[model samples]
Target: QPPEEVDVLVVGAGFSGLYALYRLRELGRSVHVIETAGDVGGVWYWNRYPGARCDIESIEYCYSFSEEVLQEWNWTERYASQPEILRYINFVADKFDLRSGITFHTTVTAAAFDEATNTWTVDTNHGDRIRARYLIMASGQLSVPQLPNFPGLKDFAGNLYHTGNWPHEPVDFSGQRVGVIGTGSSGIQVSPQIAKQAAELFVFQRTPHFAVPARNAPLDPEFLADLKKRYAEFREESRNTPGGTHRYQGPKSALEVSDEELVETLERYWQEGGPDILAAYRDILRDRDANERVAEFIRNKIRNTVRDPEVAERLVPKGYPFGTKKLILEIDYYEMFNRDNVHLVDTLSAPIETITPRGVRTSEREYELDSLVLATGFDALTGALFKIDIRGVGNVALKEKWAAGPRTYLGLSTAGFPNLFFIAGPGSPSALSNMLVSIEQHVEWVTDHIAYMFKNGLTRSEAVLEKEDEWVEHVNEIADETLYPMTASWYTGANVPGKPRVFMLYVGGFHRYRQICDEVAAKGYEGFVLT
Candidate 1:
């Protein structure tokens, strides 16, 4: 029989939530996890779309919290596909016996703090009211799906799909005319898979994003054995970097290098494959001239890949700086456009008018698609948190408090919400770095903070208002120094109409951010008020 109250209630059973549960249990705290999905594996569970795979290398993406789990599990591929990742997640869950502590298929609808008790009263969709001393939202950044707002979506006669909420079973697009909108990561990934089966594949693009070839390969047994031997050393090395990956950061500027040297360097990365191309030059993301030089190399590569100059020109990303948006890893994405049936609908030239009953109607003509896939990305960082009715001190709603934008101190805790914590939330080096590294770092920090409170016999932990304001300003100031804020990418919360244009992540390196967090905790949880 489960108890009505627990020491901690963790929402979402993803990597972050699972780690939080494990750490709290290790600390001998009574804890429970509530998940909306029927099982564990968060994004890996829901995002079972065709050709869905992790961008990060498989060896580095697994749980570093458990040495036993790391050494025991062997990854077959360089980049693990969605199914492989899901299987890995299940393996971890079963090994740790995590399911017994989690309430599956239950969504947390409302959470309110009780001032007198300094506890949280959480209501779930299953009509259960659970009380806990601390509320930790492991709700993922890109969990929520943002459907295209075109009219007549419900009236569509054909099967509709979104990559974020793809069907669990096989979705056969054989002999079908498939249309995919929004050329973000999902669109770039899903479109190629659909092209293989669909009779005609139409890709509607509003903005083109840079995609480097993912020269993925099966992991060699010898390499795997060697990696396992020094896995701890490698993991530590990654944790010390800004992006949380062990790629060698280029020291030379793109502008300083000779034209021949620049081409040779970039060509080497291109041939090697994966996202290493972004880090080819130090100033690729810092200086506009440097960015354009590298961007032109990629643009030239795209133009050379596709046979038709017209089609290749349409595929080239413009306006925004390269590496500003999340660098996408692609397998035959540009090459697929060379097929006779594959069409690129440049929505910028002929904007989408509406969705008719049979197909999509743009300014040019109506595309009669047998199936429509809205690979339109997500509302990003704050979407999942906004869904919950979270009330803090004086019954002030979390959504209301963040009407203008999210105000978080270190992206861990908000000012008004005492004893409430967020993992990989806004104002952190989230999305900008390897998610596993960021997630693990956050889980350890938040859990350690909670352990500190329990050990010291403290009740409340809320971010100081003035400190949060200072942090928010600092985050924006760092973002403004670069070209990140200039574009309307999802990093700046520009996907959803009317959403705040503030850049919601820490542009600072992961190593630097982790050091700051450690210093704060060491100073008796400085910048935070604990009672």
Candidate 2:
């Protein structure tokens, strides 16, 4: 039996959910937020490992959707760490009185759609059942951690940790032998921090990546003041960007520019830092010769920074285009290998055989370790939605539909899941874009749709199956024109075992995507079969 019925029930209480709640309340709806953690913060709440931080600048990375929330809190850092970000989230909860509506220490275990009422019947871990008019999935893109189904991984019986799902307290590797697996964003973020502490640290790497120096330092007070004065302009700029992460450059084609012109542009941005290196030249995402020029520049930088000549070559990415893969931002990822206490296990040469009781076993050797960290990333795109045993008309399971990769209409609504929306989901310019902007766009759209339905007395919004298929093809077409497909990154869902290999996320520009969304809504909500 359902205890109470709310106008809206959100599945998360992080930045997305908190903002969603604020918006829904203003729309005259009583919103209830359910979070798995004991308190708020979501990913920031859970992922509290050493050196875990945001690479994006704090000013643009925050919730600009709420002006009051933005103006009240003062961010101390340009790039915030996990703890600091969580503190900011908590402060927002307190300032906005969002905490009272949120149910902490609760997880939504199952959600069954009621075809008759067109509402969600949600079951929580605390044995509390509730019905909500709209179900918005504010779950972050990188929420689920994928522990590779390697043999004997479960039997390791050691201090194993995944970077995505980190423990709450301090992890002291002070005098312990530690083995860190994978070398993606989380590995890149935590590795140097771990290397500084562990008596001996072994990093198991599957593939070499294109890494740029974060050049991280304390946030300058003056820079932040200037940013606040131009906050509105900064927000508008990023919206039109191709990648949606930054607005430093516009959507210009690389093929349009001359060879010498492009090289000079690349070299300048490479020095500037972050993902801007490739963003300098628009055609760098597409043109081949232009790609090599940029890739060689970064490879040269890697070779120059690291001490050993042979190690540098192994660390450099040979097959992928610059910034095509998920680029790693770091202070000294390559330099960590130069340390006496740190060791690099090239999975390319010595493939990981299995996990032993002591540690990892390679084709060549097995090392003893007191702690093991599975730096392997998530199944991404649709892993979280697929895991739940939910069904649609004809009882079609989402897992079966997304078995090959995710398919959705504008990465918003699936064909079967009526009244469901994925914030910053796949098939949109999500992970490839500034997540803060993506989440804001998605959450606001979902809120508007829900409000419209309520006023019009409509049951639900479901995407036509044909529109979903076309959107999936369109997503691939956009990626095909670019060099993103050339790499074996998680963008193709290749990182997870037995996962259907298909490119996820829309490769189109954020402004273009937004334009289409706006046009669709304007044209009597075309492509949407509002019941």
Candidate 3:
């Protein structure tokens, strides 16, 4: 049973929610979390698909709040798998007793703020009514799974699965024919694993996404021990950087370098393996000419990987600038196309017409399959928040207000939604930066603001309407300067049908965003109306 009232109520038990709960308790506030999952590790708990792993290195993709957790926990791989990451989250929960404060297997249905009381009344699917002074939406960017807009989806005869909401129990696709839809990060990662077991694997690609090699290796125990000595300091350095990792930021422009020099620099990064190549040029994401130069390099790599010239051409990504969409990290994804049983179905040329009883039907042909895996990515950013019926002052629905695009000051709080906060939400350097670094910073800043409000005997807090307007305009202005706005990706809500085609994250970088957030708090929470 959840408490009827609390100082703070956090939604979703992911990295952000768990930290918010722990930190708020340390601040002597009554805090509790309501998570939809059966356990912690929000995305990791649900995304149990084969080949699921973090794009960021394991060492940097973890919580930096606790020194005990930093020294005690051990990561096995350079890129931690879903199961390993889940275990690490469980370890943190156990160590901190965070589970006690969290109500698992419960979903928040509606949250409405009472102007008179200056408190939020939250309702859950489990018939629980909770009132709290503050509501924290730690629900992640990619928490909501999206199904493709295909006809006859429910009429499918074979087993169907979504990568975002994979079964907890093991799924056996051995000796079976499998069809995977979408070529985003999840599709790229899972296809190679399914190729190993499936008798025949057909990868349906609407648009081929740019993928770099993961080249994952086991972590050295000695290196771990040495890093543990300065783990906190290392995390501070990461917090101060743009992307929130030790990825080298190349000072040279991609255009300035000759073809030979560009190839030599990028080849070294490719061999070393990871998504660090995004930072190989200072203007890769900024200048279209510079971006294309890097994009052509990756396109050539994909074309050279496969055996068949025609099949390899289909695998190559075109039209969009590289790094505009989320960059995927893959292991043997391209090499799998070399296998005789593996087939690439270019949906762009044919296009998916509908789902037949036995399999999917393309405009050109129909392919039968024993299993269908929809790697269709998340609705992302505001998706989770939109699900809940959130009403603020004047009964303004948050979903309706953000229908055009999300409007929040610092991506934390909306204007009318007093005492409500969003952790690592839109208008911040969220999906663009290392998520762990962003999550930690948002959690700390939001929690610290709550503490300040309490210390000052404040009952209500909200972003000023004028400030929200300025922030949203600023988010769009900065995004316009980058190549990100030119392409259609999840960042611009292009993946979700009818979602506004506006770039939603702060393009200024995490370190700069952090500095702005700190300054806001330091000046008694500027641009926020508190009483």
| Whole-model lDDT values for every prediction | 0.91, 0.80, 0.94
Model 3, span 1-531: residue lDDT tens: 699999999999989999999999999999999999988989999999999999999999999899999999999999999999999999999998999999999999999999999999999999999999999999999999999997989999999999999998889999899999988999998998999899999999998899989999999999999999999999998988999999999999999999999999999999999999999999999998999999999999998898889999998999989999999998999999999999999999999999999999998999999999999999999999999999999999999999999999999999999999999889899988999999999999999999999999999999999999999999999999999899899899999999999999999999999999988988999999889
lDDT of candidate 2?
0.80
Highest TM-score against the true fold, candidate:
3
Model 3 clash pairs are none
TM-score of 3: 0.99
Q: Which candidate is the best by lDDT?
A: 3
Q: Tell me the tens digit of each residue's lDDT in model 1 across 126-219.
A: 8889999999999999999999877999988899999998997799999999899979888988888999999999999998999999999999
Q: Please give the distance, in angstroms, between residue 183's alpha carbon in candidate 3 and its true position after superposition.
A: 1.1
- Ranking by lDDT, best first? 3, 1, 2
Per-candidate TM-scores read 0.99, 0.95, 0.99
Over 62-180, each residue of candidate 2 has an lDDT whose tens digit, in order, gives: 88776666666677866788888988888888877988888888767777778788887778878898887677887677778899768888778678898877877778898989999
Q: Rank the candidates by TM-score, best first.
A: 3, 1, 2
Shift of residue 365 alpha carbon in model 2, Å: 1.1
